Amino acid sequence: IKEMPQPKTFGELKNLPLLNTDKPVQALMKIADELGEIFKFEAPGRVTRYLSSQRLIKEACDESRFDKNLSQALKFVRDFAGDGLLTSWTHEKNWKKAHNILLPSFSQQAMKGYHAMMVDIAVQLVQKWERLNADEHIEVPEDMTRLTLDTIGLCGFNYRFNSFYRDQPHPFITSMVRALDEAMNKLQRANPDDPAYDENKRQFQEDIKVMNDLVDKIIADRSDDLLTHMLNGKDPETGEPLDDENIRYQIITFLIAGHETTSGLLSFALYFLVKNPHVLQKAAEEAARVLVDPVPSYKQVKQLKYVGMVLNEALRLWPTAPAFSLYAKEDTVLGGEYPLEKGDELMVLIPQLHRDKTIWGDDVEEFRPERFENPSAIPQHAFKPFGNGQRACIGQQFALHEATLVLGMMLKHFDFEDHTNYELDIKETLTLKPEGFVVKAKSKKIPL
Amino acid sequence: IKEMPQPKTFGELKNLPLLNTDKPVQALMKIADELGEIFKFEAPGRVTRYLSSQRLIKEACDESRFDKNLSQALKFVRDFAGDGLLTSWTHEKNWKKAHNILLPSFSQQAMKGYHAMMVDIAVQLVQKWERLNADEHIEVPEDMTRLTLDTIGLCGFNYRFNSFYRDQPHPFITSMVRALDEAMNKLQRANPDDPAYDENKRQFQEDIKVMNDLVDKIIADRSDDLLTHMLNGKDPETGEPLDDENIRYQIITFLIAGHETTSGLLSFALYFLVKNPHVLQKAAEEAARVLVDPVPSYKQVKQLKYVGMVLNEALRLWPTAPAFSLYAKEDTVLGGEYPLEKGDELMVLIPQLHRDKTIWGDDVEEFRPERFENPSAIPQHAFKPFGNGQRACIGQQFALHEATLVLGMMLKHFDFEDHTNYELDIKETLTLKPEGFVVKAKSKKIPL
Numbered sequence A, B: 001i002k003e004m005p006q007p008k009t010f011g012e013l014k015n016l017p018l019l020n021t022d023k024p025v026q027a028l029m030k031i032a033d034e035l036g037e038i039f040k041f042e043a044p045g046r047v048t049r050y051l052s053s054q055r056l057i058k059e060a061c062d063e064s065r066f067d068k069n070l071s072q073a074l075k076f077v078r079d080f081a082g083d084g085l086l087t088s089w090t091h092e093k094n095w096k097k098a099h100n101i102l103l104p105s106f107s108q109q110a111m112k113g114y115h116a117m118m119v120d121i122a123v124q125l126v127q128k129w130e131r132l133n134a135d136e137h138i139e140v141p142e143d144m145t146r147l148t149l150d151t152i153g154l155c156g157f158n159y160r161f162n163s164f165y166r167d168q169p170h171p172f173i174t175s176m177v178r179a180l181d182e183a184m185n186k187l188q189r190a191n192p193d194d195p196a197y198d199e200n201k202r203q204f205q206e207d208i209k210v211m212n213d214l215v216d217k218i219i220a221d222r223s224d225d226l227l228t229h230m231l232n233g234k235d236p237e238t239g240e241p242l243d244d245e246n247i248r249y250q251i252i253t254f255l256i257a258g259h260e261t262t263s264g265l266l267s268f269a270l271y272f273l274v275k276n277p278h279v280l281q282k283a284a285e286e287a288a289r290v291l292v293d294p295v296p297s298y299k300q301v302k303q304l305k306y307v308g309m310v311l312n313e314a315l316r317l318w319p320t321a322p323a324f325s326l327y328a329k330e331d332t333v334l335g336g337e338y339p340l341e342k343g344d345e346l347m348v349l350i351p352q353l354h355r356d357k358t359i360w361g362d363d364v365e366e367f368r369p370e371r372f373e374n375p376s377a378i379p380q381h382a383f384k385p386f387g388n389g390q391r392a393c394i395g396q397q398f399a400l401h402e403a404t405l406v407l408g409m410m411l412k413h414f415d416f417e418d419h420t421n422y423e424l425d426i427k428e429t430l431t432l433k434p435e436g437f438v439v440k441a442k443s444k445k446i447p448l
């Protein structure tokens, strides 16, 4: 029956000012480093627990005892993502309904239809880099966001964002960033509903309307894609199709979740490749011998075994959706020593779980794709970059196929140079990105 | 589209008399030296191809194009190991069932439970050697077989073979070797059903009963061991447990596969250590500074890094499981030059693969454990002592932990003398062992 550690407090604000930082996940990682596998985190009106060990997290992942909770971050996303898949509770009727309607369009069998459109965008990336002048460099996270946003727009909605025709991000993508910044400032204000913050909310509500015109644009224009299955698919359970309002929420949901975490993964993957040249050589050799055609096929992408190992090891060190939240379904005991009451919340700190030395050994900080050479050797719930159970990431296969195809084409067509000796700087939104990561790519002059 | 080399033929017997030798693997190695990275081998009613280069074998290890095949040796082992893990086809229902049920028993949590029993047997080895009189020598493969068989009996079935109390191998072990000898004599026979081999077959069915009754003995007695997880574990996929028939086959499977290859590895490791005194010194120094307790801990064993490199380097030169077999799942082309039809089989000649000068350099024949410092530096599929893919050795980590623990205790407690200047003579069963290898051990007088 153990007493739970807790980091330094700030009076009546409890632990909340600890999140008043521009790198909160990294700050939470440092706390778990000091306090261990579990620590209590308190805010005015809020208590949660951050789990860091596979021993405890494998228990939290028991779906009979814990269900998905909406963290404060997810409650803020809910303000425009509604009861879409990511921000609905499991007991809301629209979750299981949209889940049943939408899993068919994310199966491995469904990936074959998306592949051609994924290659369309990937070719646009390769041509951009091959058209650079000598000594021009690449802004990696920016170009990966161009790719993944264009890919989800094309594959999901048959809509072309045409990001590679833009030097500056879309207003839709710029507006998001303004909204989240206001979201995190509202926490540290004792009186957020003050008459004095109308100017803060005045610009904030404009961005919510900003997105709805694109959705009307996307719907009215309308193939075998995500948007098709939402208008014509019917839930087998209730026999019902999604209603128009929920359709709009899913489109908003898939546009965000469908691109940002995947561009982070690709950016971290390339960073680790240029910092570990032996791994890069190994990955480039596989890409060269497998991608024998000017355009990769679906089956050729499945053959990029080591590329996928690279992606998994990048996901281990820096899982770009760095946490998910749970609540206790009934009174229970965690680890035989931590009693929890019904409704008590948990946070799973994914980067800390993935650094569990009793699971991965002492070299947790080294980038070694060889950990994933045999997938069966990984214990249950030791590797959770895509969440857990029925609330796990519905886009997992989509993301990994897109990222394997794109990274394979990059390794086949260019040699990469870390010409600035880039010092990793992890920018934090609700996801993780290596900020300022730049490389030089020298074409191998292989035609498309 | 290249025409495939082939060794000398014997009329209607094709290449089969080339295997009428007591060192067939070494004979195949010599053919590979003359003919190169691939050669065809023909027998009455059978054709296969032996691969020797990482270039071709990296293609053969593609599980989308090739699956595990049962060689003639494995089909003969199947005659008493049934559909146990080693001799079942991947499409047989019992393979995946037993694979799913038994993988937990080779997890890190299971190694931690086996560790104490491994120490029990290792201490018996150290005590035997310290109890020798002056100028007495050690019969290395014999004592390594005593250790590995006792270890799998204890860790797998909570059964004590008590090999260190025996002056001659167990009759269960004598029958095994006699059975295989008849199998390899049955290979050269034109008329196997000739009545002149009735006396030969009479002992084969007697030896099978010898082994199955030992299984009864182990069964009748029946903890945290393999047999537990076989009787109480049930497959997550089908929800079913193994039936009694398959349990008996797994017990037979694990008794053989669980010890013979590992005692070969330990024997080759000690041979290479005493022939390379600088390597011996470095490994003995690591053993001294890490094994600070009278009993090694589990964590201390993971910390014997150079001992592990020694084991890997012994596995490179003399992989004690010297081959595995594959068949083409569909029509395919190997190396852009050798077309294969669906069902065509391949053999991977592991000792030759590990001598590929384009991978390891020109000093392939030298014993240098430093080759294995960085696994990321080793090209893909260059090092295959444990097989490939989902049909890779399930006991791999079990074997490496046992051999690292035992080799570390040997280096800590004794100085070793190659007093006969032993000439390596590799005996061949289905595995490889250094025959007649003897050393003298001078105790360092460190208590247990």
Ligand code: HEM
Residues within 6 Å of the ligand: A068, A085, A086, A099, A253, A254, A257, A258, A259, A261, A262, A265, A315, A319, A320, A321, A323, A324, A325, A385, A386, A387, A388, A390, A391, A392, A393, A394, A395, A396, A398, A399
């Ligand atoms: C590329 C296309 C992607 C799409 C379309 C997508 C979409 C989604 C959706 C709709 C959900 C909620 C599903 C539900 O609860 O029913 C979800 C969950 C989740 N996804 Fe993704 N995602 C993508 C990529 C990724 C990537 C690359 C990662 C990790 C690096 C990731 C991590 C997660 C996590 C952790 C959750 C669980 C969130 C929670 O438990 O609160 N996703 N995803």
Ligand code: HEM
Residues within 6 Å of the ligand: B068, B074, B085, B086, B087, B099, B253, B254, B257, B258, B259, B261, B262, B265, B315, B319, B320, B321, B323, B324, B325, B384, B385, B386, B387, B388, B390, B391, B392, B393, B394, B395, B396, B398, B399
């Ligand atoms: C020490 C305990 C060991 C046990 C219990 C064990 C057991 C097994 C089993 C059950 C399989 C078949 C797995 C499957 O197909 O699902 C297997 C495969 C294999 N093992 Fe082991 N083994 C051990 C040690 C070793 C060692 C030391 C080596 C190499 C020196 C080795 C080499 C192999 C190879 C090459 C295969 C693949 C065989 C093929 O593809 O036909 N094993 N082992």
Ligand SMILES: O=C(CCCCCn1ccnc1)N[C@@H](Cc1ccccc1)C(=O)O
Residues within 6 Å of the ligand: A019, A041, A043, A046, A048, A071, A072, A073, A074, A257, A321, A322, A323, A324, A347, A430, A431
């Ligand atoms: O830890 C986190 C980060 C989780 C963000 C994940 C968002 N994601 C998931 C999938 N794609 C995006 N969020 C806590 C912080 C907090 C704790 C206590 C009190 C106030 C705030 C929360 O939101 O509650």
Ligand SMILES: O=C(CCCCCn1ccnc1)N[C@@H](Cc1ccccc1)C(=O)O
Residues within 6 Å of the ligand: B019, B041, B042, B043, B046, B048, B071, B072, B073, B074, B321, B322, B323, B324, B347, B430, B431
């Ligand atoms: O090369 C080999 C040796 C394979 C031994 C592997 C035994 N092992 C593996 C894991 N634990 C034991 N075997 C061929 C020989 C042959 C070729 C052509 C025609 C007839 C016979 C075969 O058996 O088919």
